[PDB]
Amino acid sequence: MTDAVLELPAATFDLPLSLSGGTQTTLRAHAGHWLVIYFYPKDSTPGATTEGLDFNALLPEFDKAGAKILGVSRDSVKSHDNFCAKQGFAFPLVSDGDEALCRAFDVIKEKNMYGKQVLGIERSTFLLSPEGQVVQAWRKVKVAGHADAVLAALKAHAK
Numbered sequence: 001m002t003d004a005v006l007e008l009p010a011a012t013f014d015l016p017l018s019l020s021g022g023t024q025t026t027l028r029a030h031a032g033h034w035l036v037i038y039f040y041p042k043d044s045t046p047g048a049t050t051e052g053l054d055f056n057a058l059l060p061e062f063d064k065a066g067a068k069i070l071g072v073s074r075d076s077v078k079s080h081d082n083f084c085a086k087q088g089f090a091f092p093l094v095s096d097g098d099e100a101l102c103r104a105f106d107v108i109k110e111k112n113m114y115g116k117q118v119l120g121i122e123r124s125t126f127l128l129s130p131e132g133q134v135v136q137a138w139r140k141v142k143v144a145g146h147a148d149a150v151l152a153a154l155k156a157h158a159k
C-alpha cells in the first residue's frame with residue numbers, strides 16, 4: 001500500500017518560532033543542516049520529559065551529523081522556561097501558541113477525551129534535509145526508542 005507525502009504550506013518557511021527570552025528562529029534559518037522537529041503534547045509530563053532527555057542523550061551524535069533539534073508544543077514560553085529549568089534540554093523548545101507550526105505539519109487532532117472532544121497535539125516528529133525537504137515523518141509516536149529511531153533514519157539518509 002502507499003500514501004501521499006506531506007506538503008507544507010508555503011508560509012511555513014519563515015513563520016517566526018518563539019523560543020525563550022524574547023528570541024525566535026525560523027525553519028529558513030536552519031537551511032544547510034539537517035533538522036529534527038519533534039512535537040509533543042504538553043510540557044512537564046513523563047512522556048515529554050523522557051522524549052526530550054532521549055534527544056539530549058543523542059545530541060552528540062546529532063551534532064556530529066551537523067543536525068539540529070527543535071522540540072515543539074503549544075505551551076507558553078513561561079511554561080517552556082520552567083520545563084527547561086527543571087530538565088535542562090540542550091536544544092530549544094518552540095512555543096507554538098497560535099498553533100501555526102502545528103497546523104502546518106498537520107499534528108493537531110481532535111479526540112474523544114475527558115468526557116468530551118479535545119483538540120491537541122498528536123506526538124509526531126519530522127526529519128528535514130539541509131535543502132529543506134521533509135525526508136521522513138513519524139506520527140502517533142511512541143516515546144520508547146523514538147529518538148534512537150530518528151537518529152538511525154538520519155544516518156540512513158545521510159552519509
Ligand SMILES: O=S(=O)(O)c1ccc2cc(S(=O)(=O)O)ccc2c1
Nearest residue numbers: 041042045046047113118119120123
Ligand atoms: O501520551 S500521553 O497519553 O502520555 C498524554 C500526554 C499529554 C496529554 C495532554 C493532554 S491536554 O489536553 O490536557 O494537554 C491530554 C492527554 C495527554 C496524554
